[PDB]
Design a protein around this ligand. Structure first.
Ligand code: AGS
Ligand code: AGS
Ligand code: MG
Ligand code: MG
Lengths: 451, 451
């Protein structure tokens, strides 16, 4: 009912991802009735939109084994769109694409140990020659070169974000090998899928933050000013910083983070300077979101705070908040676990006049969180997350994350005598057999703690 | 059952130390079936691992009076490995060893009074010539030179940590004699063997600190992030600082110590600078442990603390704690005796989210502590430590150490009339007859005090 904004809605170009028959990195497959519906001729360059603001440029072909409302794509495309089989994507016509001037690609380190020879000659030139490949900045793609397969990252493009790779296109692969951990910490990046039992609130955040920035026309047309300060509150560990990260990674808006302790750690004046620099930066760049994490650090009750610099900072913030005129298109978000210790002046009309309660999850919410946490964990058949969800009454998201960590440590302990602290590497068999059992969860449960 | 991590595990190369028949400083003996099992030819340079991260480089020879699962080595090697007869050691092949360029040795002061002549000519040259001795940095070795025996320390080596001493190797013995007290305070250095009634907690520390740094692959494979802030707490004098010292000496990780009062003693800003320098240093150096001792000195509850500089430090620490990304491989340990006075922000998820209670010892634990303290004391037959353990209901390790000191002072008092405060030296006979009796302990017990 209120949750209406979160609903996906069926569109002509909103398609479910299926596994590819054509395993080329540049190709996506559609049924023939769907291509006619979208006015897409064979071999047209297309723009695909995934999760977490991710994109890929592909060339579209007709497939008969494919269903009407499905799209076929390999792992390389699915990775670049940060999607798994079954997820929905947008498909857009893309006749805009310029021919490429200069591109800069680099190999992922762990897929490139032993023999350089020439990376352009062995791998890249046979991959691109006469292929007229569409590529996007930040694409990770795989190329076989007889012997084995090397993954490459598109670092730069001379036509703005995406281009077609023609014979003209100078292919550079100059610098050091791109680190594996960097790109794995990039897949790590928090999206809305990584936040559990918070549906009602994510709906509220998209209403108050995402909707007025992307569509200011709506609010201006109806005759209403968009609320400009949203304050997330709730007990420690409920998911506020997580939502902050999600929003940062999910929004069309420019995002600026301010950490409370990070500001208060600075020299007198140099902190007030960074607060100003934040707001000037947000004003300068697009529709924008300013996220003040741990607000109570910077803005406690002026009445009960000893230092002059500390009182000056709260005043600096209040001024900035009223300093944005309507036409700035800047929303300030803030998170706290002690809302009652914030200066009431900041919670007045026009400032942080809207509150989102990120409270304690219910039994249903906890199950989501457990499913989110264990999505990379090796679990046994006998693990019942429904059972764990019910036995975890007072638990919030942080408590559940800890529970899963201790369940895993227990499984490591059960494998201890086949492991020693002294040897350089752990045995390969021991690594594979590692599964977290329900027994492990019950041991974690017996140790667990509220609030 | 949980304690599984502490268990030693039998290995082909894990051997018991027996007394040597071959009394050379460079030589270790093994049975012939064991040499074949480890693929060790006669006269191969080997690396031995002892207690408290200590090592020796030896040359291996076959012995027939030696058992299969035993190793023979003299006092000098045992000293260098900080092991006594019966302790287990690792043995490793070592064919890496370069020929030495320059070494720097120095004599131990008390073993060098009267006649210099030439230390290199009389002692060192005949010890090394055509012998191709393996030596490690930090080795203390004894050499006879007709008249008497002088102990020398290896201060420096031009091939990194260890080298072979060939005729090529320039032998320097330039500087001042190394002080006896320096090397006895180096034998003094704390290891896990010096910490009593803390088995459960030592196992926890190895799980949360040692395991994820030496084997990050386990936690990454199972799909779990390693906890990154461990907080030791308990009453005054239970052994927190003692464990701190033990870990520092026992770990494969680079270790950085921060003392609370040592930071708070510094000028405004220059304290925040050392904190950053500590974290930047730990990040720069390997897998690392940062130990913040007496954390309550640096991080009290921001709500109830007067100084602006004092509030700024807590903020500085929080920022550093969060500043470490997962892939830093740095664990922060901290100790306190008033956990309830630390800012709660620091005890949240991702910060100091794990706790180890170093509590009051039980009757069994007290016995361990008394055995650890008295290992260098001269005791009598009638001294029953089990009796003393039972009569010490409220006592913690610090109280037990003090109890032992006062028992010993009593034994000195019993010997008083044969001693006087005015004479330059104490009589030789009086020194040897000094034993701490049971009666002394009952006197110590009558004086003792709780908490
Ligand atoms: N609703 C949630 N869904 C999924 N994971 C969660 C959720 N809440 C917490 N977690 C996990 O717990 C961790 C810590 O939660 P945070 O987002 O830091 O809590 P917080 O609300 O910011 O707490 P405070 O107020 O800063 S102490 C996250 O990194 C997640 O792994
Ligand atoms: N569990 C123990 N095992 C062996 N010796 C101990 C133990 N606890 C205390 N001691 C002895 O008592 C001395 C003082 O203990 P510390 O390690 O300083 O205690 P602490 O827990 O650091 O106390 P705080 O919190 O700094 S007041 C040590 O040097 C040891 O000699
Ligand atoms: Mg938070
Ligand atoms: Mg201490």
């Amino acid at each position: 009912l209120s949750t209406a904004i979160l609903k996906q809605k069926n569109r002509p170009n909103r398609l479910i991802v299926d596994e590819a028959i054509n395993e080329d990195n540049s190709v996506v497959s559609l049924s023939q009735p769907k291509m006619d519906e979208l006015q897409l001729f064979r071999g047209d360059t297309v723009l695909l939109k995934g999760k977490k603001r991710r994109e890929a440029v592909c060339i579209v072909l007709s497939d008969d084994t494919c269903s009407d409302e499905k799209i076929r794509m390999n792992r390389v495309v699915r990775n670049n769109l940060r999607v798994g089989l079954g997820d929905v994507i947008s498909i857009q016509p893309c006749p805009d694409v310029k021919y490429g001037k200069r591109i800069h690609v680099l190999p992922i380190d762990d897929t490139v140990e032993g023999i350089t020879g020439n990376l352009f000659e062995v791998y890249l030139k046979p991959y691109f020659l006469e292929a007229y490949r569409p590529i996007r900045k930040g694409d990770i793609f795989l190329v076989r070169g007889g012997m084995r397969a090397v993954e490459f990252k598109v670092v730069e493009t001379d036509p703005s974000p995406y281009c077609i790779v023609a014979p003209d296109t100078v292919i550079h692969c100059e610098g050091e090998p791109i680190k594996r951990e960097d790109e794995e910490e990039s897949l790590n990046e928090v999206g809305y899928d990584d936040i559990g039992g918070c549906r009602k609130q994510l709906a509220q955040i998209k209403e108050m933050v995402e909707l007025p920035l992307r569509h200011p026309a709506l609010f201006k047309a109806i005759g209403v000013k968009p609320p400009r300060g949203i304050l997330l509150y709730g007990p420690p560990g409920t998911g506020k910083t997580l939502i902050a990260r999600a929003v940062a990674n999910e929004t069309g808006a420019f995002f600026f983070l301010i950490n409370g302790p990070e500001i208060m750690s600075k020299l007198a004046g140099e902190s007030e300077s960074n607060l100003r620099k934040a707001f000037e930066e947000a004003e300068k760049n697009a529709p924008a979101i300013i996220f003040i994490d741990e607000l109570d650090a910077i803005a406690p009750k002026r009445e009960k705070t000893h230092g002059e610099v500390e009182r000056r900072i709260v005043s600096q913030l209040l001024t900035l908040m009223d300093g944005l005129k309507q036409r700035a298109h800047v929303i300030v978000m803030a998170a706290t676990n002690r809302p009652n210790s914030i200066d009431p002046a900041l919670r007045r009309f026009g400032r942080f006049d809207r509150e989102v309660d990120i409270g304690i999850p219910d039994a249903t919410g906890r199950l989501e969180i457990l499913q989110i946490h264990t999505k990379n964990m090796k679990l046994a058949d006998d693990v019942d997350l429904e059972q764990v969800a019910n036995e975890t009454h007072g638990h919030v998201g942080a408590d559940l994350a800890a529970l899963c960590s201790e369940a895993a440590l227990q499984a490591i302990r059960k494998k201890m005598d086949l492991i020693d602290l002294e040897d350089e590497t752990i045995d390969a068999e021991v690594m594979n057999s590692l599964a977290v059992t329900m027994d492990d969860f019950r041991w974690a449960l017996s140790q667990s703690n509220p609030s």
